Amino acid sequence: MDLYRQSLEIISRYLREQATGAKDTKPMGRSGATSRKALETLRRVGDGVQRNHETAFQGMLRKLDIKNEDDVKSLSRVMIHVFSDGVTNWGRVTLISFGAFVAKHLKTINQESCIEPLAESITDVLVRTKRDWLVKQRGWDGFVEFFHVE
Ligand SMILES: Cc1ccc(-c2ccc(C(=O)O)c(NS(=O)(=O)c3ccc(Oc4ccccc4)cc3)c2)c2ccccc12
């Protein structure tokens, strides 16, 4: 729940700002500096993943044919099915970036009400299936470190 609330805040913020185009700047709950830095790496890396995977993401999004809230709920079984199954690494992030891509689509089709639930679906899939890996990787500090550039 420590890692969950922190992941939910980062993923939820990232998804909301990708959708609306407006950066939400208000609190720094659950390891404040780590979350600010996680959110920063996520918007640099996440935007790169969407840029470099526009064709795949557009293809997949069209295939998914998300029209309403119930279509967003149906996404979770595919999400769990694909996201687990094999090897886990920071690159596999693509999960969040694809989520941000879907969140953008959701704003476009007047389904902004599904962005927060989608963020919760992604966090549930991420934290509940990979907690042990995440804690061993020092959580979001690990994500920040792995993607640290300069
Ligand atoms: C809302 C939402 C966020 C993130 C994922 C997700 C999960 C795992 C991976 C992964 O690779 O572990 C991933 N990365 S992906 O390459 O974008 C991708 C790879 C395979 C997919 O399956 C299809 C299923 C159906 C249609 C086309 C493709 C889709 C995307 C992204 C979602 C995956 C599925 C649905 C919603 C999702």
Hey, which of 73, 95, 122 would you mutate to test ligand 1's pocket, going by the most ligand atoms within 8 Å of its Cβ? 95
Terminal alpha carbon distance of the chain: 32
Structure tokens at 142: 């690990």
The whole-angstrom separation of Cα 34 and Cα 29 is: 10
59: containing domain: 1-147
Burial of 10 (0-12, 13-18, 19+ CB in 10 A): buried
DSSP string, 60-76: HHHHHT--SHHHHHHHH
Integer angstrom CA distances of residue 125 from 51, 99, 107: 24, 12, 22
Burial of 132 (0-12, 13-18, 19+ CB in 10 A): exposed
26 alpha carbon – ligand 1 mean position (Å)? 30
Q: Residue 64: CB within 6 Å of ligand 1?
A: yes
The whole-angstrom separation of Cα 74 and Cα 72 is: 5
- For the domain that residue 87 is a member of, what is the CATH number? 1.10.437.10
The whole-angstrom separation of Cα 64 and Cα 87 is: 24
- Number of domains the chain contains: 1
Q: Which residues of 41-61 are buried (b: 16+ CB within 10 A; e: fewer)?
A: bbbebbeebbeebeeebeeee
Which experimental approach was used here? X-ray
DSSP string, 84-109: SSS---S---HHHHHHHHHHHHHHHT
The whole-angstrom separation of Cα 42 and Cα 7 is: 12
Chain centroid to Cα 28, Å, comes to 18
Which atom of ligand 1 lies at the shortest distance from residue 85's CA?
12
Q: Diameter of the chain by CA atoms? A: 42
Would you say the C-alpha torsion 100, 102, 104, 107 has a positive or negative sign? negative
Contact at 8 Å (CB) between 126 and 81? Answer: no
The whole-angstrom separation of Cα 102 and Cα 28 is: 25
Q: Residue holding tokens 């009400």?
A: 113
